[PDB]
Design an enzyme around this catalytic site. Structure first.
Site, PDB file in Angstrom:
ATOM      1  CE1 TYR A  13       5.786 -35.568  31.026  1.00  0.00           C
ATOM      2  CE2 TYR A  13       3.505 -35.955  30.340  1.00  0.00           C
ATOM      3  CZ  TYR A  13       4.512 -36.046  31.295  1.00  0.00           C
ATOM      4  OH  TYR A  13       4.222 -36.608  32.514  1.00  0.00           O
TER       5      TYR A  13
ATOM      6  NE  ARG B 232       6.387 -34.253  37.641  1.00  0.00           N
ATOM      7  CZ  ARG B 232       6.595 -35.445  38.206  1.00  0.00           C
ATOM      8  NH1 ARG B 232       6.693 -36.552  37.468  1.00  0.00           N
ATOM      9  NH2 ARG B 232       6.725 -35.528  39.531  1.00  0.00           N
TER      10      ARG B 232
ATOM     11  CD1 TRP C 230       4.824 -39.653  39.453  1.00  0.00           C
ATOM     12  CD2 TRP C 230       3.004 -40.703  38.675  1.00  0.00           C
ATOM     13  NE1 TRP C 230       3.712 -39.004  39.952  1.00  0.00           N
ATOM     14  CE2 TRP C 230       2.586 -39.631  39.485  1.00  0.00           C
ATOM     15  CE3 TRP C 230       2.030 -41.519  38.071  1.00  0.00           C
ATOM     16  CZ2 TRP C 230       1.236 -39.343  39.711  1.00  0.00           C
ATOM     17  CZ3 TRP C 230       0.685 -41.237  38.303  1.00  0.00           C
ATOM     18  CH2 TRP C 230       0.301 -40.154  39.111  1.00  0.00           C
TER      19      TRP C 230
END
Ligand SMILES: N[C@@H](CCC(=O)N[C@@H](CS)C(=O)NCC(=O)O)C(=O)O
Ligand SMILES: N[C@@H](CCC(=O)N[C@@H](CS)C(=O)NCC(=O)O)C(=O)O
Ligand SMILES: c1ccc(-c2cc(-c3cc[nH]n3)on2)cc1
Ligand SMILES: c1ccc(-c2cc(-c3cc[nH]n3)on2)cc1
Lengths: 198, 198
Positions: free
Chosen positions: A7, A13, A103
């Site tokens: 990530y 997330r 975002w």
């Protein structure tokens, strides 16, 4: 199995997966990428999104789908079929709100305006619905901690970065966050994690 | 259990739940409301959104949470934990995409423009991803139908209303739609369900 989480260098997330790994005392490689290397990595992914979790060379995607996979048949899932349903619904309710934020918006003025709107106009109602739903329980679902409680603490952490007064009228929700943070395995992680804005 | 599903007279977000009931041969009440009755019902709901499912007098919310609940312990969920992760991930990928559409946009030109944009850029991109993910395989996950295949047929049916040629270059995704529609319980349902645009 051998775990590799990929990530950005952010809670974002992937944090739900990171709390689950911490609480279940499972070892994994916490792989964080720089934005500049994202285009290259993205082009090799079936659906071009992160986080992803590699389990013995098999790639899994979708953060909540991964969280449910890891929490299945553990004390973090609901204690019954119907409790499991409430766990997933609270998570989905939280996710539906977080997903509204742009975002990746490139225009900064359009981005912050959008953020301001959601935080000022929408967040307070979620807090109300959450607070009322919590009622007099110790946890969001049933009589013990679930990953929905983890998701609440994670999501609210970020909402509080932008809107510190968000829970001023919700002490019961502040208490819930503290209870999650006080869990020794989660407390250790919060202490250990790279500190990022998001 | 006694099941009562409440939503608008529309396929929309309740349809995946209706397909599952049909496939599993579970009898339920398909309660469809009118606009005028929404404010009153809404005020009664913890999170003020539909669909909701009442099971023996107990209310459940969040369509996918409900769908997963209904498929629990059946072959529609995915047969193994890891295949369940993939079923969940595909559902999530599809839902993420559908959520980009301004379903509630009241300015017809903005709605027309956003839809066309989404159907010109994002949709063709996703279709290529899904097409290569499905490959020459029978179903999206494993070797038997899951609610991920149901969700593809459902989501695509609504997209085909706005871009009738969306799948003209994806015969494998059309074939998957046909296989789902042809399951007897599904074929039966499609024929008797109320006809609505969405
Ligand atoms: N619902 C998905 C959302 C995944 C997603 O959109 N991730 C973002 C980062 S949080 C991403 O891959 N952005 C880079 C891009 O879209 O190219 C999930 O929970 O995994
Ligand atoms: N993610 C939720 C969406 C729930 C939702 O936004 N429901 C809509 C109908 S599709 C609704 O009740 N909107 C009208 C309103 O909020 O008053 C789900 O799948 O159940
Ligand atoms: C649920 C929890 C957290 C998030 C989230 C996504 C991001 C982000 C920032 C740049 N790109 N993505 O930050 N937080 C989204 C949904
Ligand atoms: C998955 C399948 C279908 C849908 C959907 C939501 C709507 C809608 C129309 C007016 N209001 N809402 O129509 N289709 C959303 C996600």
């Amino acid at each position: 199995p051998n775990y590799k989480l990929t990530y950005f260098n952010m809670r974002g997330r992937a944090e739900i997966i990171r709390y689950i790994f911490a609480y279940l005392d499972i070892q994994y490689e916490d792989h964080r990428i720089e934005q500049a290397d994202w285009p290259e990595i993205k082009s090799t992914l079936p659906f071009g999104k992160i986080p992803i979790l590699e389990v013995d060379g098999l790639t899994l995607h979708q953060s909540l789908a991964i969280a449910r996979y890891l929490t299945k048949n553990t004390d973090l899932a609901g204690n019954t079929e119907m409790e499991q349903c409430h766990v997933d619904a609270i998570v989905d309710t939280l996710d539906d709100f977080m997903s509204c934020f742009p975002w990746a918006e490139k225009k900064q003025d359009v981005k912050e305006q959008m953020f301001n709107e959601l935080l000022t106009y929408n967040a307070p109602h979620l807090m109300q619905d959450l607070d009322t739903y919590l009622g007099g329980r110790e946890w969001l679902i049933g009589n013990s901690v679930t990953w929905a409680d983890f998701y609440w603490e994670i999501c609210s952490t970020t909402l509080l970065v932008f809107k510190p007064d968000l829970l001023d009228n919700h002490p019961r929700l502040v208490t819930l966050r503290k209870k999650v943070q006080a869990i020794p395995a989660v407390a250790n992680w919060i202490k250990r994690r790279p500190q990022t804005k998001l």
